[PDB]
Structures are given as C-alpha cells and as structure tokens.
Design a protein around this ligand. Structure first.
Ligand code: SF4
Ligand code: NA
Length: 348
DNA sequence: AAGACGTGGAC
DNA sequence: GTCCAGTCT
C-alpha cells in the first residue's frame, strides 16, 4: 500500500540535484566503488576522502592492490581503523584476480563469497557498478526506512535489517537500482539526519509515517551499547647508542592485527612486568606520561616508560630494530603513534 | 546472537 | 559522558 512511484520519483529527482561530487562518484568502476564502500564502513565520509585518494593513487587498479605487499596496504590504511577490513579486502582482490581474472563478480552469491563483503557491500558495489538490484541497507538506510515506515524493531538484530532489505525490494526502483540505493544513503546523510532531521526539506515527507506521527526524532530503535572494558597497558620505548628503536609486529589475529607497536604488556607493577617480558637485555626508567585511548569495545590506559637498550644478541622476530629515521615507514596504531609523540616531547 | 574490531566528529 | 559514521565469528 505504498505509492512507490511517487516516492521513487521524488527521491531520485532530489538525488540528481543534491548529489555530492564525491571522489568515488567520478565513475562506476567496481574496484573504486569496492574500495570506497569498505572504507566508509563505520567511518565518516569526510574521514575517508583523503585515505581514498592516497590509496587509489598507490593502488589504482584491482591488480595493483592484489600485487602489493601486505605491509604496503596496511600503511595506506594507517589510522583509518578496523584494520581487518583492509586485510580482508587485500585477500578478496587477490581471489578476484586469480578466480575471476580481475573482473569483480557481478553475481551476488559469488561476490558475497569474498572476504570482508557482507550484505550491504554486495548491494552497494553491485547496484552501483553493475546495476544488480540488491538492497544496500547500512545503518543510515535502516534509520531512513525505520522512519518512512514507522518500524520499532531494534536495528541491531540482524533480523531487523532483513526486514528493511525486504522493504527495499518492494519499494526499489528496479529501473535504476544503483541510483535508487545511493539516493537512500545520500538522503540519510544529508536530510534524514540521525538527530534534528530536516523533514520539511525532505523530498519524501508526505510518504513518511514517522513525520506524520511526529516521532522521527525518536527513531531508529537501537539498544544502548554495552559498557567497554578498561585495559591497563605498559609501553616500552627503547633506544640504543645509535638512536635505533625497538618495535615489534603484533600477531595477525585479534586486536590491531599485523600493526607495528612499541612493546607492551597488559599489566593489570608496569615497569617490572615490562622488564620481565623483554628477557625472553635492557633496563627502564620511571614513567613519563599516562594517557587513554578508546576502542569500540575497550579502553587502553597506557603508561610510557623510557629505557636504554644493550645488545646482547640478534633482535629476533617479531621484534625489529628501527632507526628513528625509519620509523616513519611502519604502520602504527594511533595509540602507539601518540606514545611516540609524547616520548619525543619528553626528550625535548 | 552478540562480542570483537579503530578512529574521529557532533552533540 | 553519548551516538553515530558492517563484517566476521
Ligand atoms: S520526512 Fe523526516 S523522518 Fe521522513 S524521511 Fe524525511 S527526514 Fe526522515
Ligand atoms: Na562474505
């Protein structure tokens, strides 16, 4: 019982007028669409634009990305967040090069088989680049649809998303699915804002149940996030006579996977506990700073300890000896990028 | 299902 | 402080 064409025409017409000239919107190349869509996951547009430009300059084609070293891609993603995204993407393009020859699959099931690609990305990439009419329901669309159709379901349950996707199937403009999908996302970004929605400027105010009932400001429905754990972290900054610095690569599974870091222990006696780990030859000074750094699911409480490094053997993996002049090359998390900043300030 | 998984911007 | 900008497991 939806005036689908009336809603479609107003939304699609409004999108052509208000469409932002974003970098990934210069064309409909799947690789560039695929890169932008992954980057945009849980990340604001304004944050992504520069990463996308540097990334695409370093990796202009799917084959360039697949052919690149794992550490080269991680550096390009340095500071963007959720780094498993890029590791999954780097693997996914490698599969596309070998399995599909470098042509991004146009089949939803085939593309959804690739790593890091879920329901939104299949809809987004395939609807825009190839025209496949698969729904592209992100958090923004779920808010838009929860207001257009007054849905109280918790948008957290995967099932609630499934309903919205089925809604998109029926209201979609199968005529131009790609333009229909990105119109919802652009509407969610520009008009149906998370707070203080501008429903008077909305091209689809008439077709919106929530605005009629006056409760758009009270949607979407979502459970309050669980409180995060607090994790004390002791961090060692170690220098030898020649100014080289001890850094180590984190394991490829779990938190900040394959990122380089200054050696640390989750000391829940920091200086002693740091000094025990290293033995498996150096001594530490008193702390110089303590600062916090937030994750989605926990908070690090860091404390930086300067120290001197005496070489009694080869610096074996995962550790590596890095001159100060070479640290700029490795990819560090923002947390340990701040460890270094505070360390050099203290040196001054 | 719900926790793991980064970082930054706007309230 | 809160909320927001998906996929794997
Ligand atoms: S009328 Fe208001 S609630 Fe409805 S889609 Fe537009 S901005 Fe969102
Ligand atoms: Na997948």
């Amino acid at each position: 019982r939806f005036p689908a064409r009336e809603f479609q025409r107003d939304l699609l017409d409004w999108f052509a007028r208000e469409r932002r000239d974003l970098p990934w919107r210069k064309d409909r190349d799947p690789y560039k669409v695929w890169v932008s869509e992954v980057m945009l996951q849980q990340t604001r547009v304004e944050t992504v634009i520069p990463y996308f430009e540097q990334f695409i300059d370093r990796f202009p084609t799917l084959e360039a990305l697949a052919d690149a070293d794992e550490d080269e891609v991680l550096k390009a993603w340095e500071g963007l967040g959720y780094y498993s995204r890029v590791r999954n993407l780097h693997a996914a393009v490698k599969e596309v090069k070998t399995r599909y020859g470098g042509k991004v699959p146009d089949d939803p099931d085939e593309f959804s088989r690739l790593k890091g690609v879920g329901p939104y990305t299949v809809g987004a990439v395939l609807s825009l680049a190839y025209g496949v009419p698969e729904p592209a329901v992100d958090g923004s669309v779920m808010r838009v649809l929860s207001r257009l159709f007054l849905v109280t379901d918790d948008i957290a349950k995967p099932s609630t998303r499934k309903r919205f996707e089925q809604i998109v199937r029926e209201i979609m403009a199968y005529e131009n699915p790609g333009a229909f999908n990105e119109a919802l996302i652009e509407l969610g970004a520009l008009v149906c804002t998370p707070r203080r929605p501008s429903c008077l400027l909305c091209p689809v105010q008439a077709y919106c149940q929530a605005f009629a009932e006056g409760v758009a400001e009270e949607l979407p429905v979502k459970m309050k996030k669980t409180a995060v754990k607090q994790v004390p972290l002791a961090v060692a900054v170690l220098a030898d006579d020649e100014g080289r610095v001890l850094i180590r690569k984190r394991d490829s599974t779990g938190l900040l996977a394959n990122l380089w870091e200054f050696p640390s222990c989750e000391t829940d006696d920091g200086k002693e506990k740091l000094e025990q780990m290293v033995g498996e030859q150096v001594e530490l000074t008193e702390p110089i700073v303590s600062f916090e750094h937030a994750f989605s699911h926990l908070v690090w409480q860091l404390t930086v300890f300067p120290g001197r490094l005496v070489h009694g053997g080869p610096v074996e993996e995962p550790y590596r000896l890095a001159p100060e002049d070479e640290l700029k090359a490795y990819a560090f998390p923002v947390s340990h990028q701040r460890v270094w900043r505070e360390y050099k300030e203290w040196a001054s």
